[PDB]
Amino acid sequence: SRYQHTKGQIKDNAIEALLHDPLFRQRVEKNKKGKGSYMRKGKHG
Amino acid sequence: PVNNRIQDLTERSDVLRGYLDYDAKKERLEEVNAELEQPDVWNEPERAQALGKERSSLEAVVDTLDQMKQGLEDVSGLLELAVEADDEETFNEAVAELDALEEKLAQLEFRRMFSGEYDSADCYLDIQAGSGGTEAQDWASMLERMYLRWAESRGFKTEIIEESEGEVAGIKSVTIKISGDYAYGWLRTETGVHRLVRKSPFDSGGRRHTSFSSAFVYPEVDDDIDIEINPADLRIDVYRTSGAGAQHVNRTESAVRITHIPTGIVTQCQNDRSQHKNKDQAMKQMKAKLYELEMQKKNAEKQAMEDNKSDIGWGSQIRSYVLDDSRIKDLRTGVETRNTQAVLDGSLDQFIEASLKAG
RNA sequence: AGCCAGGAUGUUGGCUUAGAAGCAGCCAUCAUUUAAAGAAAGCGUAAUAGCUCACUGGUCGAGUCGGCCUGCGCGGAAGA
RNA sequence: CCCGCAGAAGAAGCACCGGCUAACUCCGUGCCAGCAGCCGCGGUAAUACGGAGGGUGCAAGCGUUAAUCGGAAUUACUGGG
RNA sequence: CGGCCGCAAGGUUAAAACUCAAAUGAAUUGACGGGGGCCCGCACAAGCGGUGGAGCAUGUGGUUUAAUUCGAUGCAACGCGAAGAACCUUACCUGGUCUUGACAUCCACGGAAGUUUUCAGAGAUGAGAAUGUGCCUUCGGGAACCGUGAGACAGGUGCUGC
RNA sequence: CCAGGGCUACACACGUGCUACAAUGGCGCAUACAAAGAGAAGCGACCUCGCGAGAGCAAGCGGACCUCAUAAAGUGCGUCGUAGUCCGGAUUGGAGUCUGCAACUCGACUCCAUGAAGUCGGAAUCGCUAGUAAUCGUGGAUCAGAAUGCCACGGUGAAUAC
RNA sequence: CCGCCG
RNA sequence: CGGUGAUUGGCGCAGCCUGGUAGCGCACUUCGUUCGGGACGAAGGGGUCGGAGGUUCGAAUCCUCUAUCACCGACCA
């Protein structure tokens, strides 16, 4: 199925417009433990 | 001894068979000649020459492989039965049947990955980092080292043209020209988004990132050989100019209208006193207006063709590069490698050659 | 010049083994059967067919065929 | 409505199972496919996805959606600042 | 926005769509401050001799490579893992070989273990030709070692120090 | 599993070192004073040969005794006369020694010849307050061989801290 | 005195 | 259309009239400084002067031709 992208009416490049689109934003994950790992309640209980 | 080519010619003979549906090409061929069993195909020659064009393609594809089917067995069978004799004339006749098969194989190698619209011409990579900060830019330059250590290893020449370096590390963009023979044929399966998962030395937390980078391969071509049209296709009238100052504006036919009937755009000029200068200005003015109708002919194709690439879905995430878990997985062809430090810094022919056989 | 005849063969000539058997083109442009018949000048075919012409006999019965140097002419030649 | 006839014979589903909120493990998949009322799950050892076994709830019904009041002392006269 | 007021600036009255799952108040423990006070270490100051320039030695990045194995990479990686790479080491590369295997256990068969040399090959290996045939007797056998076949399996300096 | 190759590649960039750029120095002769370690397929006297690295021979010692092993800076005497020079010891040609199956890739050392950059080093930057810095040599581990590295030992011996 | 960013 | 005056490093401009030797800032490269980037500092490197031909022993300069850009004039019926 289709994808409703950000950049309305992409002209030239058909692949370097989507690279800035939030489909290809940088997925950064969370640490544990690690500079930024506070729980407050974890996955269970 | 010579069993290493005998074992090598077998493995690359059936991958051509599997990635063409070797049994099912004769299936279509037996449907082709079934319509040729009817005598009355000759009443429609627009349909008739279409069928015989498809026939010789379906014939010559399977006939290269059906003679290969006996060819793998007997050339081995010439030597594996006369290793009992160990005869030296047998080695002379075995290699004569061999390189013929190796020619039939390699011309069927270069048959499908040939292929179409100046596919053999020289190339341009245009790699970008996109989004993510430094880590996306450090991965845009690892792709730069990866292809420059690949495309130099197969006999091409690298020419860095435009380049945008990072503020701290890596590059923002690079645009190389990679020239050789069949350059674009090896690089047309690279236009996509290369996904990198690792842990940044540039992140302060040492967290795990998932960066993306484009690598847009496009082939070169000549842009414009564009001149004046045939003057029969343009209509030139003259008339009295509209203005004031004297009746000099209203006595002489000093204006000009050049009308281009294959398009229908009307270039006019009233700028000068003399018709010969107005006609000379309006002729050059219309060749500029024939540039723009040919730019807008190109630019509308550039928008319409890549409203399709935009709407493919998932924007071609081709080849996950997951370095922290030490694997790598191509996406449209599914070939997987466990060597990450070999695919980085060269050795991309597991991924390219397996994706030139698939469509 | 007419009119009556033949206008042969391996020659599916390789060729790109998709075609060109003379017929879009590279060569070669042979030898054979021949009184002759281009390993083809038009037609005709995707390519082979099919229809003619070069060339060859019969017929007929006296002049004929293409160039050169020139004299006078014709077309080209439509305005209020 | 009553008597007689035969034959266990014709008759059990739907939701849920991380916390709230009763009820858990294995397998598949790997920020994908998906879930979701809120907080949020999924980045390779997911009680949260999907399936399986087990269990809990209601039961000829069981859930979702919508609407209303309740919880809400969250327009408070009762009953706030 | 509309009204009223104003010469104007604008005041006053005063929404909704939409969006977020919080925004906020006081106080606690830290950390930080180009806030304060006190105090110490070659920290500065006072000195001495270096490094940076030169040549080489060694390690690293890059580049090259068939391979230039892998790990270490602010301080706290870079004469580090290596208290020592000609072969070996050695994990890498090119080619030549092998599959219950170089090393381990179990089963069935052979053979005492070993010692002497030839030939082919770069060697691994591929055959030989020679020699020896013992310690305990169920005397279909031991134990030690070697060869072979069959499957459990061995093997991995392969991956993840997240 | 094996043979050859690579880890020693080299337009380059950085780190840590050693050697220097000299006269408080170089060379030549003579001469004084150490500590700590190691040694058995090991350390290897005396003697003889070789200019030398080394070889031959053959004692001693698993050692407070035998060997490695003459300590070097120092001091005496002579010359050099401030020049890229009698400084520097890079690179290289030739001839060798030893280890090892093997020294081409790629070992150390000796002899003869060669005689490079370097005349105290930009911005910058490091170590040290006492037997320390600095300088001078010695021994060990790893190891057949192969250190300027590491780890230890003693010689001389400061300057400065308001 | 100058002293911006993550 | 003529006439005027330019083209010099990646860019923006000096030197060109007066013939023999090309700079300035910024950007680039290496180093330093910082945990890192910018800023700062220290070293550097880069052009044969729009193309083509003349004059001279010699042309970025002096003439002539184009090529491009900019400014000005293109009036009277």
UniProtKB/Swiss-Prot annotation, chain A:
Residues 32-45 have a biased composition (Basic residues). Signal peptide: none annotated. Changing G8V: 75% decrease in kcat for peptidyl-transferase by RF2. GO terms for molecular function: ribosomal large subunit binding; rRNA binding; tRNA binding. The keyword rRNA-binding applies. Keywords: RNA-binding, rRNA-binding, Translation regulation, tRNA-binding. Interacts with the 50S ribosomal subunit. Interacts with RF2/PrfB on the ribosome. Contacts ribosomal protein S12 (rpsL). Belongs to the alternative ribosome-rescue factor A family. This is Alternative ribosome-rescue factor A. It comes from Escherichia coli (strain K12). The chain holds residues 2 to 46 of 72 of the full protein.
Curated annotation (Swiss-Prot), chain B:
The modification N5-methylglutamine is found at Q247. Its main location: cytoplasm. The keyword Cytoplasm applies. Methylated by PrmC. Methylation increases the termination efficiency of RF2. Is absent when the factor is overproduced. Changing Q247A: No change in complex formation with TnaC-stalled 70S ribosomes. Changing R195C: About 50% ribosome rescue activity with ArfA, initial rate. GO terms for molecular function: translation release factor activity, codon specific. InterPro entries: PCRF, Pep_chain_release_fac_I, Pep_chain_release_fac_I_sf, PrfB. GO terms for cellular component: cytosol. It is found in: Cytoplasm. Keywords: Cytoplasm, Methylation, Protein biosynthesis. GO terms for biological process: translational termination; viral translational frameshifting. A motif (GGQ motif) lies at residues 245-247. The keyword Protein biosynthesis applies. The gene for this protein contains a UGA in-frame termination codon after Leu-20; a naturally occurring frameshift enables complete translation of RF-2. This provides a mechanism for the protein to regulate its own production. Interacts with the ribosome. Recruited to stalled ribosomes by ArfA, in the presence of truncated mRNA, ArfA influences RF2 conformation so RF2 can hydrolyze the peptidyl-tRNA bond. Biotinylated tnaC mRNA can be detected in a stalled 70S ribosome-RF2-TnaC-tRNA(Pro) complex. Peptide chain release factor 2 directs the termination of translation in response to the peptide chain termination codons UGA and UAA. Acts as a peptidyl-tRNA hydrolase. In the presence of truncated mRNA in the 70S ribosome, ArfA and RF2 interact such that the GGQ peptide hydrolysis motif of RF2 rises into the peptidyl-transferase center (PTC) and releases the ribosome. Recruited by ArfA to rescue stalled ribosomes in the absence of a normal stop codon. A TnaC-stalled ribosome binds RF2, but the active GGQ motif is prevented from engaging with the PTC by TnaC. Belongs to the prokaryotic/mitochondrial release factor family. This is Peptide chain release factor RF2.
